[PDB]
Amino acid sequence: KLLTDFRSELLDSRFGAKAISTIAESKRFPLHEMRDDVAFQIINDELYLDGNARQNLATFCQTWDDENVHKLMDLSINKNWIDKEEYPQSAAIDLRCVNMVADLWHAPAPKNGQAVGTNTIGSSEACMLGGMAMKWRWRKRMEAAGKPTDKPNLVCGPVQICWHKFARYWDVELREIPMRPGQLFMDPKRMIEACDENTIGVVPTFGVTYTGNYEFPQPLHDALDKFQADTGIDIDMHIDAASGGFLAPFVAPDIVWDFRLPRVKSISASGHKFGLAPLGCGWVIWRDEEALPQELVFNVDYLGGQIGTFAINFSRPAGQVIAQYYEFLRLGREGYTKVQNASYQVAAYLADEIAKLGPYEFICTGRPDEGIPAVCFKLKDGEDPGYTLYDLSERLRLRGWQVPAFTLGGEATDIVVMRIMCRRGFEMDFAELLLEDYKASLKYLSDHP
Amino acid sequence: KLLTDFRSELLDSRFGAKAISTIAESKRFPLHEMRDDVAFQIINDELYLDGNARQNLATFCQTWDDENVHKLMDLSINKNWIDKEEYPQSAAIDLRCVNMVADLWHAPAPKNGQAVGTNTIGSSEACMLGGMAMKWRWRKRMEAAGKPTDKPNLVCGPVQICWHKFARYWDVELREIPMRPGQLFMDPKRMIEACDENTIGVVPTFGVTYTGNYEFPQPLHDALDKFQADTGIDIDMHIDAASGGFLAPFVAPDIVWDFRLPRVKSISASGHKFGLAPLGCGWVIWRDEEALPQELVFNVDYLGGQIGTFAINFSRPAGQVIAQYYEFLRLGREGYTKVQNASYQVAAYLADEIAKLGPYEFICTGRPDEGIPAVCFKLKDGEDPGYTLYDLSERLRLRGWQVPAFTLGGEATDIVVMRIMCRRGFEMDFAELLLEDYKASLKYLSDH
Amino acid sequence: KLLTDFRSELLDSRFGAKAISTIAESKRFPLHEMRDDVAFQIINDELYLDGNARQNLATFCQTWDDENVHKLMDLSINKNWIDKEEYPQSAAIDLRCVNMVADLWHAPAPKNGQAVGTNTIGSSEACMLGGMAMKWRWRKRMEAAGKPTDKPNLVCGPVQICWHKFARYWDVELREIPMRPGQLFMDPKRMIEACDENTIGVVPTFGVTYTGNYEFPQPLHDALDKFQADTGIDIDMHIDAASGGFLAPFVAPDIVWDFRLPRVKSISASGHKFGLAPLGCGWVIWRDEEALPQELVFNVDYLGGQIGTFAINFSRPAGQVIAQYYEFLRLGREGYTKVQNASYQVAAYLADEIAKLGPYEFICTGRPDEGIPAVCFKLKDGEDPGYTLYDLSERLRLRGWQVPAFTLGGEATDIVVMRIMCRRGFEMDFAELLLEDYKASLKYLSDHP
Amino acid sequence: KLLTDFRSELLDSRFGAKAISTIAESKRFPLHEMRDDVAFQIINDELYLDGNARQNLATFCQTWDDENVHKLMDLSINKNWIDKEEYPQSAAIDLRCVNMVADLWHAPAPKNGQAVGTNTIGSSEACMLGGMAMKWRWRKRMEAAGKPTDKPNLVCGPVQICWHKFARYWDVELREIPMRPGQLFMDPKRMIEACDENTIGVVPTFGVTYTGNYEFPQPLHDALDKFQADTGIDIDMHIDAASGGFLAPFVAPDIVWDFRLPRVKSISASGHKFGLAPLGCGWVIWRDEEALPQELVFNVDYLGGQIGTFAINFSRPAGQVIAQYYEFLRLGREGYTKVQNASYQVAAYLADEIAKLGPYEFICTGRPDEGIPAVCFKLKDGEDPGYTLYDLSERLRLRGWQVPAFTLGGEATDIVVMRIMCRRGFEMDFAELLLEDYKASLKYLSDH
Lengths: 449, 448, 449, 448
Ligand SMILES: *Cc1c(COP(=O)(O)O)cnc(C)c1O
Ligand SMILES: *Cc1c(COP(=O)(O)O)cnc(C)c1O
Ligand SMILES: *Cc1c(COP(=O)(O)O)cnc(C)c1O
Ligand SMILES: *Cc1c(COP(=O)(O)O)cnc(C)c1O
Ligand SMILES: O=C(O)CCCC(=O)O
Ligand SMILES: O=C(O)CCCC(=O)O
Ligand SMILES: O=C(O)CCCC(=O)O
Ligand SMILES: O=C(O)CCCC(=O)O
What we know:
This is part of a larger assembly, with 4 copies of chain A.
Chain A: H1 2-11, H2 36-46, H3 67-75, H4 88-104, E1 117-120, H5 123-144, E2 153-156, H6 162-169, E3 173-176, H7 188-194, E4 199-203, H8 217-231, E5 237-240, H9 248-251, E6 264-270, E7 282-286, E8 298-302, E9 305-309, H10 319-355, E10 360-364, E11 374-379, H11 389-397, E12 405-407, E13 416-421, H12 428-447
Parallel strand pairs in A: 2-3, 2-4, 5-6
Antiparallel strand pairs in A: 1-7, 6-7, 8-9, 10-11, 11-13, 12-13
The complex binds pyridoxal-5'-phosphate (4 copies) and glutaric acid (4 copies).
PDB class: lyase
Keywords: lyase, glutamate decarboxylase, complex with glutarate
Entry title: Crystal structure of the complex of Escherichia coli GADA with glutarate at 2.05 A resolution
């Protein structure tokens, strides 16, 4: 029988083959090789249950990339970002990106022509690096003054989860100012009340994930200036600009949020959100050499010279930084402006149209001077139109859309909001389709209450 | 006037276009859009200066991937690993890989059908997760007996730099036993001298980068058993198996290095090394739930339920894990054995042939019971054949090969070695071409 | 065991397969078939040792072709250039190319609307054809005068090797005017001194390979006019325009080098150098029907008529002539001008920048009125900066560049030059990279003398 | 005004664009650039008028190539065959092909491990190299005995035109023994009558184009042996094996035609015929170093060493040799035999079936011991079935087939034959369709 078994293995179509007759292994390392077309097909087919990323309106990350980015990423699948000597031109492109991001954020013109900063996998790694640099600068300052350094704290607003991870992993007490009704962000008064000489720094979120709105660093900065005048305590900022960092420079250049403020010692952002890079690209820039403690830096060989690295990851692909550079050259300020405008235009259209459909109060309407291209809203207080925003999120899912409804944190856990993200590749015509599905979902719900 | 400029912008070939007449911007964010084919061309051409990855014999990482992996990675370009609810089947495939890797390393069969471990970007993140968990278990041990926890140290041999970064970033004193002539590894005697009540753990390197040889955990394990009997101090191990974790299980199954040893609480390896995954894949497995302190774990929603995450990175692509899972199913144990065997057959051929060409002493000759598929050698003490291994490396570079020569560390900084890595995609016929260039280089050097 | 051997042959990945475990056959015809993916992979991988053609700066031939040329060549892989009846439209396209090249070189407007000339594989074949036509025209002239025809000679400057091959294969004495310091080309005085009644013709090289400079035919032509007035000996020219033939018409149309000169009876050029065709395309044009002896022509069938062929090769692909025609239509004079300008611009930039780095004397600086887009230079006489140009060529190779250093011939064998060719696909940004590597190579050499 | 013209140039579909409204330039170098997609489209469409190469049954050359060959040729588009130092591994692969072809033809095992021979663009260049070498060896023979060298001749049968070009271009008198009814080849008796002390060599055609039959060198060889005994004149042979050199070694190994015969000093063949290479590949091999006069050889630098070149062409692509080498490794002797066998099985089927349809006399029926896989036939003497083979050829053309009818040369210019070539890619099912059209054509002709 084994002779014809081989014949069938050779000649059978992939759906007729004996190999595709079993459920895929999920518990132990498999013993045998299998026909490669069958292994590929089974996995391809499972991934349909992820759903359609273009209809995922919960994520802030890129769900479309141009044809040149597909090619560049494929060309770069084996290029190792950390091996600066072995892939020297990829390393040179990375360093150009550092200069360009620093220039966008108005970093002081660097002495030797190279800005201080690095690429990362994402804002998470970039925030941990900014956070370690803060803890170290604070330690040195406390040692100069003969104070103990065993109780650091960090003051912040409604941050993304990575900051809670930072605090846990590096033994820093987190002082989060809670959201409450009427102020869903860190205000200067509440911030100052949480500051003391053990505060390693303050972290405004320039593009809050929950609501889509900017926390503005300028009023916070004014308070810290007054704090130093009144107490002598000198506190710095790190801006978590995961979203806002590739938005405001293009569509709202007069907001003063970046290195134009002297206490901003570092800024981080996700290239793979509004920076237009594919997943796996983040940036952190320091204001100058003094803002990055040298004891955190590890030197590696690079072309008869040496380059300073600051990284948690080691080997990883260089495609994403190469793709980021392509977007910088191909679009420039002009192109980024047009692409971001298109997102804000779609958000404004949706905020405008959804307003006429129900009893809603908007927290974010996609104004460029207020936040990111997002639409965020709640049911108006003490109305019951016969559905919750959860019921509406569920109806929209029947058509493949992921549109999240969730409660806020802090003292706002009573409040349920729905948030729609407007990214590149969510064009007006495609938005109109979501809107048709929103109208049809409401029709259904008003008929089955 | 500007109309003839627009006409040319539309019609010019990309090498004749005005946009390709300038040097690419390097200092400031560019102001204007440019023709996409021109932007692509300039960058594509710059990247030729990286050289040829297939001829890079310095790296341990994958420099070839099969056609299915190219397809899967392109299909997964925008699938987010951290968003378990948004990409639920990518998440499920990830959990299968954790089970399979735990099985490979003889993790005790899991209670609830799911091994304790996680995917990472690479061994570096995986080692920091393993390190933090070691430091936390030690803190708890010390607190149960009323003792101070302010002076943690970690004992190790000739580790990769990520362990130096771990020590610096988490304020742990590193006790690195230095390499010395005649012992280029952590021996049990020196390991014990460095251990005390403040030792959070011992990290053997199951595949040392500098030499390619295994540090064998078993004799170290016997020593820590006597240490506990003698002193009452109970020390765990984490195995840094960045290369070895996907070699020995297939080609040297009788080496006892993994969870079969009681003191081994966690193990890490690089999928994108000998795991055959593309760049951006690592693993760490814990022996059971008790080995991972729950205060390090952050729970997320997953399909009505909740799953525990332990990660430093947040958003990052899921293609590498999907690729890994494809290699597991497509190759299985049988195919992994055949692929690694081809690498060892190539290392053994080169060790053999290079030995005829000069006065060389081999530190690693590509034997599977002793290490990874690498060739590592020095010039014999005493002899001077008229060249150093640096001159040899430079001659080989003229033909595009990257073959590193470097000094060893610690107390062996007088020893210069050359190391050749034999990876997937460095087949016998291709290695013969390297050997012909080695022969040509020596001839040239003897004539000068 | 043979049963599982087959299983493995079926199922094994290409790098795990038993077939890829041996060194490739190099001595005898192999006996067995092998899996086709393994045969392809082994050969693909060997070819990496060729290096990167885009970084080969020694060659004058095309190392990049546009996407339409890749498609047209693939479509034409089986189309046979010599089979005029069997591939009749490919044959018609070839004939159009002849008219267009003749028109570019100012050939007299042809009587019946078809110029006299042919496509070849390259300038080598085209030069042998021009050379045979010269030998035959001379024989006839010598017979009319009752002189013997057993000692033909050919007068020339610093020619490419094909002319030495011509002389050896057709029993013609080669009278090469040697290069000497101060005149690296054939001058009118030395040329006339080598001319006699046995001279079948004179061959100026319009784009000398060694230096990159034009030998100008006009001053030579004036001398031959005077020679005929003084002695009655009437000598013709063939221009070897391998390079210059697709440069000067676009960027220096006022140089009189072509059929505007009455003694120019034929001209050859390589399409696959500056003609922008892929390797395998050359052209030779005769001034009129009388310049091509009929006894050298073989007629073949073509559409109820007959076409005259003159060719050494027989079967060969027609893709290259098809690609040449596409470039003619797609670029025209306008497009060729822009592409050649881009090469001259890169050469000027490199001549300018290299000048500041060392004690150099330039022989070619990429001026369009003087020669081709090449940079050619030597160490200044009696300086020793502690390296030779050989040492510099070697350092540049570490980064994958092929930049040749070599001695000149004739009485200039003391002189070592370095030559950089600037072709299509060697854009300014890419040139800047070579320049960085040149600066870094000099740093190294001044530190290890 | 001109702004609406630019807008249209950007937006128009390629068949709606203004640029495609004119007839392509044919007389003068064009003045302006045009949209690249339009330039491509016009030319692509013109090339439909070539007809379908797969249906061209007149040619001996490859009209199909496998996917790997398409890839290799595209990858080699810019690799220069003549630049041995600049493309050194392309050069090395070329030298392997020379060894393998010499081995196939039973060349005496080479002294220094490298056969004497070269790749060429085709048999035509290869025959001129072989011819020049014959003329030079003869010159030297004559000079050693004080004799004049001004009247060389060459003796041959029904050769392809390249031999006529060789004679004209190198001033050699051609002594072509003409075909005649009952003997359509050079027989030993007429060959000897044409030989004298001025004969540079004899060129048998191992695969005659006009008929498809082999001229067998062995009986000619026996005759030249008697000639030397009788007269003392020593004459060499060059075999023009343009088709036969890649057939007989695989399917008729017992035919003695190659270097097994002492007088055979050189052999040429077309790779791009039955060698399975794409257009642009030929070979010529010499029996040893002595057979190739060194004054014809031009040396070039190759990796510290130097190699001898003999070539008329200079720059030309290296893809065809790389492709050839791929077919050698991928097929070997086993696969070449299976491919050629399929061609002979198709010729034998057609000879068989066409014989039932009319009053025909076969000159070639696709037997491997007699010739190449071709069908060649005439109308039987006497009979007139109401059509000529020209009418038949024209009816077949209505369905896209190119099947030539033509008169034979020499003293047989009264004989009209039809010839069908059975190449790779003319499979049994496709040949059945040709036979159905042949049947339909005859029916039509009988009704008119
Ligand atoms: C996304 C985000 C992060 C996390 O960054 P990744 O790019 O996902 O690593 C941190 N903070 C904010 C405000 C974010 O939006
Ligand atoms: C490669 C390696 C590392 C680093 O892992 P990455 O996968 O590069 O992050 C750590 N330790 C050892 C022994 C290694 O070989
Ligand atoms: C290139 C060249 C040749 C040879 O032509 P191919 O195109 O290489 O056959 C002859 N003469 C000169 C001046 C050349 O530049
Ligand atoms: C085809 C052929 C030739 C010509 O060879 P090409 O490969 O077309 O140059 C010469 N002689 C014979 C017998 C042929 O068949
Ligand atoms: O943008 C992401 O993918 C992660 C954060 C927001 C979310 O998806 O819920
Ligand atoms: O494997 C790698 O790529 C990183 C470390 C080893 C090296 O390249 O030297
Ligand atoms: O252009 C070529 O390829 C041949 C001549 C110049 C050279 O390469 O050396
Ligand atoms: O094989 C060829 O293509 C050329 C000669 C034979 C013919 O086509 O008639």
